[PDB]
Amino acid sequence: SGPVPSRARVYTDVNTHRPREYWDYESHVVEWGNQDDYQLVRKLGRGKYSEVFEAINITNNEKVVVKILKPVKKKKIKREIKILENLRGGPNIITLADIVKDPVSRTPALVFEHVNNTDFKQLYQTLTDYDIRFYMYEILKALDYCHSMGIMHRDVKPHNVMIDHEHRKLRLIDWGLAEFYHPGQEYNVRVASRYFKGPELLVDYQMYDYSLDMWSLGCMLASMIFRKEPFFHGHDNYDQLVRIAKVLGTEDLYDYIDKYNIELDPRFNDILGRHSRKRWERFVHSENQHLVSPEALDFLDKLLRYDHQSRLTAREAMEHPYFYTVVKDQARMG
Ligand SMILES: NC(=O)c1nc(-c2ccc(C(=O)O)cc2)nc2c1[nH]c(=O)n2-c1ccccc1
């Protein structure tokens, strides 16, 4: 009597009906470009796993971004490369332009198209209702694509959505946690930023799917239209589920748990307490009301659901009335 299994309700078998070489990234043989084409200009940041630099391609003088991988699992490097190659050319997917190694030290690096992303304090002060609808649509294009290509991103958050606002240009980046979906597979629940973790991760339910990304997207939407980043602000993973339950209510949480026969740490029930489900209207104020509409709230309500099987797919999301004005305007013959 363990947890009830689950499988994605869409794109369930997309990797099943593809050649082994598509999803078997361990078998992937890398063709390396030339390290000496790129000059590092400045360090942009660093994670547990890598350091990221602004760089110049000296053959054509174009800016790029170089991510140098610290000596981690060769498996995870091949996984990320295979995913990036599989998704290359997809809508709003960051373009992997090159892969290079030091021939002597054997350290690999990924080379990406450069995105001149807008400051954020600037975006926070000027994004309109239409802007948000537009960029949400563009994110959904990316997620529907990678999901249709059998891949879960698993780290959707504002920092991984780069926006060059003056060119109305968006890219979904940081595919380092992304993974192929195979039905019935149990996955690591230690993915996504705390604030963007779905309830399935927080209750250690491992047989999750693409719908994880839709929870994360809902958190981003809430953060944007209510002007509170992050929207659910827990101080640890336990507290994160408490923050969700204070909004979504504990009754639906326990129904979720009950449906999948999930067992909670006894301490969770003590700290989860008892909370009513709130109305989304509660978070609307004079300062954010210009970004909020009935359509926005209906849409949000269909993303932020405990049951992962209940959330909108990316395709279904793109069909929502919230996007009516955007979809009209993008019907272009160019
Ligand atoms: N194109 C850019 O402009 C660009 N691309 C990436 C990027 C990273 C990883 C991956 C990946 O691993 O898939 C893809 C793309 N990261 C960027 C970036 N511009 C930028 O300031 N950072 C950044 C900032 C702070 C901390 C870390 C990174």
Answer whether 150 contacts ligand 1 (Cβ < 6 A).
no
- Using an 8 Å Cβ cutoff, are 317 and 299 in contact? yes
Q: Give the gyration radius of the chain's Cα atoms.
A: 21
Q: Domain coordinates of the chain in residue numbers?
A: 6-23+115-333, 24-114
Which residue has 């995105």 as its token pair? 115
- Using an 8 Å Cβ cutoff, are 96 and 88 in contact? yes
Of all protein residues, the one whose alpha carbon is nearest to atom 27 of ligand 1 is 45
108 φ, ψ (degrees, to nearest 5): -90, 160
Q: SS3 of 254, please?
A: helix
> What's the half-sphere exposure (Cβ side, CA atoms, 13 Å) at 88?
13
- Using an 8 Å Cβ cutoff, are 142 and 152 in contact? no
Answer whether 147 contacts ligand 1 (Cβ < 6 A).
no
98 φ, ψ (degrees, to nearest 5): -165, 160
Of all protein residues, the one whose alpha carbon is nearest to atom 21 of ligand 1 is 44
Listed residue (273, 278, 294, 156) closest to 217, CA to CA: 156
Q: Which amino acid is at 323?
A: F
211-226 and 129-148 helices cross at what angle (nearest 10)? 170
Task: List 170's β-bridge partners, or say none.
Answer: 163
Residue 38 Cα to ligand 1 midpoint, Å, equals 16
Six token digits for residue 284: 């609307």
Six token digits for residue 118: 């807008």
CA 194/CA 156 separation, integer angstroms? 11
Detail the DSSP E strand segments found in the chain.
38-46, 50-57, 62-69, 96-101, 108-113, 151-152, 161-164, 169-172, 179-180
Q: Supply the DSSP symbol for 17.
A: T
Resolution (A): 1.7
- Using an 8 Å Cβ cutoff, are 89 and 146 in contact? no
Within 8 A by CB and 6+ apart from 225, the residues are 132, 288, 291, 292, 296, 300
Among 65, 98, 171, which is best to mutate for testing ligand 1, by the most ligand atoms less than 8 A from CB? Answer: 65
**Dihedral over alpha carbons 152, 154, 156, 160 (to 10 degrees):** -100
Per the entry, the structure determination technique was X-ray
Residue 111 Cα to ligand 1 midpoint, Å, equals 10
What does the DSSP assignment read for 143-211? Answer: HHHHHHTTEE----SGGGEEEEGGGTEEEE---TT-EE--TT----S--S-GGG--HHHHTT-----TH
Report how far apart, in Å, the C-alpha atoms of 212 and of each of 101, 102, 193, 307 are. 33, 36, 12, 10
Residue 72 Cα to ligand 1 midpoint, Å, equals 18
Among 53, 67, 153, 191, which is best to mutate for testing ligand 1, by the most ligand atoms less than 8 A from CB? Answer: 67
